[PDB]
């Protein structure tokens, strides 16, 4: 179809609204902004009212299907917004979506919002049914590498001058929380109409609202950033994440890394990575970890992880975060 990014949808929308729009991504802010832009353009082009339906195992598909053929007594045009579940569609929902796609017409600016679909969901009848003229917008969260560029670009968009230090601080405090990041940018613009947000001007108006997953901590350990790892642990603990899943992902990737380090003296790193099915984006990070980490450090990490799991699984679970921080520090030397 037409696959675009949030910075391209604004230009695309002035070329004429399409039959359907699919907003795919894990970032709530990008999805919200793209949906708002689509709705504003639709209102400009004559779409007055809008209908919202969250897809649930108890979705009133008859109501929405009637809505496809529901005309407008006092209104003229109409949109139709669908909120996909966190796991995406299945057989029944995809069949319903195929029927809805068959029900599109001049009206029905069908809008689809949710998280990115998998390759299996990619190869589906409904997806191919609107595969000629629909517009798909990718709305994934920028990662650690591209976050400073993204926040600088948005600050330029919002007529705000930002420094490198302020960009780093905003990326640090609101990583994975770009909703709070945009709210912070708006707050800083409101508090200071000058727009020159120096480092002290942003240090006094931000709070540690960043959200992380266990994989973020695993990658921080592999890169060796002790401070980032400890920050991720603090954020995960304040969020209330169960330490067991952290220990599980740590165990899985640490066992894989121990196998790699053991086999390094036998087979080159490329073939070892290939055999163990290592993703390309993390091969350099894991090779750096293998180079930095010694066999003694790996044995000590395994020992500490085993002690931590034994402490947890014996129904005590007391001060497991201290042991996790100890392991994090140990793996970053």
């Amino acid at each position: 179809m037409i696959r675009l990014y949030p910075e391209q949808l604004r230009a695309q929308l002035n070329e004429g609204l399409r039959a359907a729009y699919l907003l795919l991504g894990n970032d709530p802010l990008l999805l919200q902004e793209s949906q708002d832009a689509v709705r504003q353009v639709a209102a400009a082009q004559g779409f007055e009212e809008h209908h919202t339906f969250s897809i649930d195992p108890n979705t009133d598909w008859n109501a929405i299907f009637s809505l496809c053929q529901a005309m407008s007594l006092f209104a003229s045009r109409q949109t139709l917004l669908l909120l996909l579940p966190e796991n995406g569609p299945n057989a029944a929902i995809n069949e319903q979506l195929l029927t809805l796609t068959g029900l599109l017409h001049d009206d029905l600016l069908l809008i689809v919002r949710g998280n990115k679909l998998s390759k299996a969901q990619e190869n589906a009848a409904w997806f191919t049914a609107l595969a000629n003229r629909s517009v798909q917008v990718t709305c994934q969260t920028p990662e650690q590498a591209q976050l400073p560029r993204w926040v600088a670009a948005r600050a330029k968009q919002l007529n705000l001058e930002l420094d490198d230090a302020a960009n780093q601080v905003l990326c640090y405090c609101y990583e994975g929380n770009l909703l709070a990041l945009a709210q912070a940018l708006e707050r800083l613009s409101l508090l200071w109409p000058d727009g020159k947000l120096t480092l002290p001007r942003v240090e006094q108006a931000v709070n540690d609202a960043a959200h992380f997953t266990p994989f973020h901590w695993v990658d921080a350990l592999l890169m060796g950033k002790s401070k980032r790892a400890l920050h991720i642990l603090q954020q995960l603990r304040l969020e209330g994440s169960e330490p067991v899943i952290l220990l599980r992902t740590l165990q899985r990737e640490l066992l894989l890394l121990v196998n790699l380090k053991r086999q390094s003296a036998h087979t080159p790193l490329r073939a070892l990575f290939d055999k163990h099915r290592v993703w390309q984006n993390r091969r350099g990070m894991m090779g750096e970890a293998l180079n930095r980490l010694s066999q003694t450090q790996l044995r000590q990490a395994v020992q500490l992880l085993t002690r931590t799991e034994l402490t947890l699984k014996q129904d005590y679970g007391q001060s497991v975060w201290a042991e996790l921080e100890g392991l994090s520090l140990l793996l970053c030397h």
Binding site: L179, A180, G240
Partner: protein
């Protein structure tokens, strides 16, 4: 002879009487004066920081005959009816009381009906993070398109449990825990207006013991006045804070490191008078030593949990070689191992501290 509680008698009535949170007050004033008020305001701070006070003041600004503004008036009808807690359409809800999706739905059936008085129908939900996920989703669904005169005010101590999607619907404010200076100045003003004799050192002790919360400072001030017959001297506050002291493990570590046997004995006897379990004391001593070792490894090992005693912890990390930390940790580990079979554990913990002091 009223002698009412100083906590609520001194709740702020105008925005100029709120200590700290200056950026939040400026943002609220700017939204009330020139801009259009956002359809939902969420507040997140610490215990006794000002959240509900700020929300109530904002609701007072919303409903008033002078109009929607920052500093509306004094002693008006709506402002007084809010200050007395008797306002009709200023709904006050505890989220924990109505976590059920059915009760939440019943609460959200009231938004359609027009306000009885004023302009805006204001809902004030406390500890909003405790709402169930279904109730939270219903709240978001009613927040996306609220009525033109219906507004929501939400407060929570820990916003980390709130899903990120709440940021998509409401404008959030974070209130910074007050420092020693602001709390001390506000307590000084309160005591000066109430004609309470006091000393600056007593105020400093109260502020430091408050740990950032002004409600804690006011409660401690009330206790100090009650015990001291209004004469709030340094010695009175110091003694009554020592009665409430629970930093025994940290002081034990500090004194045992300094090879101060008499100090350790006095502190352990005080802990015995406190009726503290000895196994818990020893395990938290082990935790303190482990934290010292970790912050020695890297300055970032510390967090905000120990942000009350972080100064002494930094000094301990700076001054104590890691070998001494390892020796002390081993000594306390074997002491905890041998504690159950020892005599009455009040003396087993003592003798474990003895063994620790032997490494001098």
């Amino acid at each position: 002879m009223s002698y009412q509680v100083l906590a609520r008698k001194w709740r702020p009535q105008t925005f100029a009487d709120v200590v700290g949170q200056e950026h939040v007050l400026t943002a609220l004033a700017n939204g009330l004066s020139l801009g259009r008020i956002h359809h939902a305001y969420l507040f997140s701070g610490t215990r006794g920081v000002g959240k509900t006070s700020i929300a109530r003041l904002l609701a007072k600004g919303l409903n008033c005959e002078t109009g929607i503004t920052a500093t509306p008036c004094g002693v008006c009808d709506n402002c007084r009816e809010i200050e007395q807690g008797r306002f009709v359409d200023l709904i006050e809800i505890d989220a924990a009381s109505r976590t059920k999706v059915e009760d939440t739905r019943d609460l959200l059936d009231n938004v359609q009906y027009a306000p009885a008085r004023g302009r805006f129908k204001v809902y004030l939900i406390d500890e909003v993070h405790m709402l169930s996920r279904h109730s939270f989703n219903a709240l978001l669904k009613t927040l996306e398109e609220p009525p033109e005169h219906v507004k929501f005010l939400l407060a929570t101590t820990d916003p980390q449990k709130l899903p990120v999607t709440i940021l998509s619907r409401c404008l959030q404010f974070h209130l910074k825990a007050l420092d020693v200076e602001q709390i001390r100045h506000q307590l000084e003003h309160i005591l000066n207006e109430e004609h309470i004799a006091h000393e600056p050192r007593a105020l400093q002790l109260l502020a430091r013991a408050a740990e950032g919360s002004l409600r804690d400072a006011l409660s401690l001030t009330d206790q100090a006045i009650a015990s001291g017959d209004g004469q709030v001297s340094t010695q009175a506050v110091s003694a009554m804070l020592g009665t409430l002291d629970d930093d025994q493990a940290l002081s034990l570590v500090e004194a045992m490191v300094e090879a101060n046997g008499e100090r350790v004995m006095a502190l352990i006897n005080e802990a015995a008078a406190r009726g503290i379990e000895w196994e818990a004391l020893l395990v938290e001593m082990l935790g303190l030593l482990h934290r010292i070792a970790m912050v020695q490894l890297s300055p970032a090992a510390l967090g905000n949990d120990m942000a009350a005693i972080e100064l002494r912890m930094r000094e301990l990390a700076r001054t104590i070689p890691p070998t001494d930390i390892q020796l002390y940790y081993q000594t306390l580990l074997i002491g905890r191992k041998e504690l159950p079979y020892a005599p009455d554990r009040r003396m087993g913990v003592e003798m474990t501290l003895l063994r620790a002091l032997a490494f001098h």
